Design a binder for this molecule. Structure first.
Ligand SMILES: [Cl-]
Ligand SMILES: [Cl-]
Ligand SMILES: [Cl-]
Ligand SMILES: [Cl-]
Ligand SMILES: [Cl-]
Ligand SMILES: [Cl-]
Ligand SMILES: [Cl-]
Ligand SMILES: [Cl-]
Ligand SMILES: [Cl-]
Ligand SMILES: [Cl-]
Ligand SMILES: [Cl-]
Ligand code: NA
Ligand code: NA
Ligand code: NA
Lengths: 7, 483
């Protein structure tokens, strides 16, 4: 959802 | 561990099925802070569906976490080749570019994505200012030199030395200075620097007329440095001038050179020394009063300005400050009455309607202010010397540009006034920046950038130099987005 997270 | 040779030979849904599996395994490792395993599985998934931007985006998150900035750029760029609007890939690529100090690229991606932009803009401004690292406007110089008695200043050169071969050049310099003309200041600056160099050579047999002459060249070359914002240079020569022949100008000038918003005591101390050297010198009181004025000490400002006024009643400037004090005290009628009595005594002087125009503007009486600006400009035109310069053009343009909120005459009127002002006084930062902002509002980005850039060269302080460059760097980014 934000940048420090993968998808 | 996946046999990616075999997986490739599977049906299209099955290969899809495996990329999904393998991506999630990578996500597991990323979360376990095992970034080399993460990257390895994402590259596996890429072999099975090269079309999915999330694999590239996930891999760049890994490299954000290891510090490999070049790799972040490559992988976010791969994500963005597929899908130019992928938000995380734009956010991550901007971040790596800020880290590489590629601030314009950072700003571009952050703009496309749609405080961070601020930060890169500010870092870009300082970068260009540092890579990049001139006398003030004729308007400012005529204003500075306005209080001085020019005949007294020019006659202050001693003709009686038996060795002084610089004094005729110095007298030329002073004569040019007090001519209050464009050529006059340019020639003055040249001749003063040359005079100082000759005096330094001469000083190193000598007599007391040469020494006083030398103190005079150093004093005025000193103040030219201050005016150009070379503060150490100014202090050096003014101290030298003091060593040779203390004078009230040297102290006044060194006080200004050393002015200190934190603590005023040294300033007043210099001014006492200047007073003792000549209690009857009007610029001493006028300058000290300007400081009390700046410090809002209105009682003391008034007494100093009355004193300068009584010692030289033919200078308009003490009258003006006295009228301005009544207005800052909240007595507008008394101020206006003092201006009118001052205009009666100096009916040819554009100084009076110019400063009164500024008070009218401050009260929000804009139409009267413009009328006063129109008068001052006509009065300025008829004089043989510079008095107020392009101040009435800028005064009137600022009001018209503001009032036009779009009022398309008013706006065009302001443009032509500022263009005129930039032509008549090319070294004016204020006229350029003022024009630059209007050019930018007209979407004249190329013209605006050049204006901001010249203004940065012309600005005195770091802070002003950096404000100008910031405006220019912002505009270059807007130009790139539109490109
Ligand atoms: Cl791209
Ligand atoms: Cl970027
Ligand atoms: Cl860049
Ligand atoms: Cl002489
Ligand atoms: Cl001049
Ligand atoms: Cl100079
Ligand atoms: Cl002496
Ligand atoms: Cl204050
Ligand atoms: Cl006066
Ligand atoms: Cl007048
Ligand atoms: Cl830029
Ligand atoms: Na440099
Ligand atoms: Na003139
Ligand atoms: Na100016």
């Amino acid at each position: 959802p934000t940048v420090e997270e993968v998808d | 561990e996946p046999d990616i040779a075999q997986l490739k030979g599977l049906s299209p849904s099955q290969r899809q099925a495996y990329a999904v599996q393998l991506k999630n395994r990578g996500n597991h490792f990323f979360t376990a802070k095992n970034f080399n395993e993460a990257i390895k599985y994402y590259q596996y998934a890429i072999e099975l569906d090269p079309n999915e931007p999330v694999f590239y985006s996930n891999i760049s998150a890994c490299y954000i976490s290891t510090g490999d900035l070049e790799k972040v750029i490559e992988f976010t760029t791969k994500a963005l080749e597929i899908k130019p609007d992928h938000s995380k890939a734009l956010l991550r690529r901007a971040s790596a570019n800020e880290s590489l100090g590629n601030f314009t690229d950072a700003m571009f991606d952050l703009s496309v994505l749609s405080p961070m932009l601020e930060r890169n803009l500010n870092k870009q401004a300082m970068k260009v200012l540092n890579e990049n690292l001139v006398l003030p406007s004729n308007t400012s110089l005529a204003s500075f030199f306005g209080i001085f008695d020019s005949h007294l200043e020019v006659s202050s050169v001693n003709t009686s030395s038996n060795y002084d071969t610089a004094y005729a050049l110095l007298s030329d310099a002073l004569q040019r200075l007090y001519s209050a003309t464009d050529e006059g200041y340019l020639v003055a600056n040249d001749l003063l620097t040359k005079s100082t160099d000759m005096y330094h050579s001469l000083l190193s047999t000598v007599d007391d007329p040469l020494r006083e002459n030398a103190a005079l060249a150093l004093c005025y070359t000193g103040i030219f440095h201050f005016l150009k914002n070379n503060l150490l240079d100014a202090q050096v020569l003014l101290q030298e001038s003091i060593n040779l022949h203390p004078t009230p100008n040297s102290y006044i000038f060194l006080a200004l050179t050393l002015a200190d918003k934190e603590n005023s005591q040294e300033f007043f101390k210099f001014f006492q020394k200047a007073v003792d050297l000549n209690p009857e010198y009007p610029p001493t009181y006028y300058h000290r009063g300007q400081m009390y004025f700046i410090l809002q000490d209105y009682k003391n400002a008034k007494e100093d300005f009355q004193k300068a006024q009584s010692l030289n009643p033919e200078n308009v400037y003490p009258y003006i400050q006295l009228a301005c004090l009544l207005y800052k005290q909240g007595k507008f009628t008394e101020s206006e009455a003092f201006f009118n009595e001052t205009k009666l005594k100096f009916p040819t002087l554009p100084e009076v309607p110019t400063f009164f125009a500024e008070i009218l503007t401050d009260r929000g009486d804009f139409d009267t202010a413009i009328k006063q600006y129109d008068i001052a400009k006509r009065l300025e035109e008829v004089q043989e010397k510079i008095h107020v310069g392009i101040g009435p053009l800028i005064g009137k343009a600022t009001i018209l540009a503001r009032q036009s909120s779009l009022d398309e005459e008013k706006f065009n009127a302001a443009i032509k006034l500022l263009t005129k002002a930039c032509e008549l006084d090319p070294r004016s930062e204020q006229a350029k920046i003022g024009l630059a902002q209007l050019k930018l509002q007209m979407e004249k980005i190329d013209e605006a950038i050049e204006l901001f850039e010249d203004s940065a060269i012309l600005a005195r302080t770091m802070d002003e130099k950096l404000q100008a460059t910031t405006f220019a760097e912002a505009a270059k980014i807007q130009k790139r987005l539109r490109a």
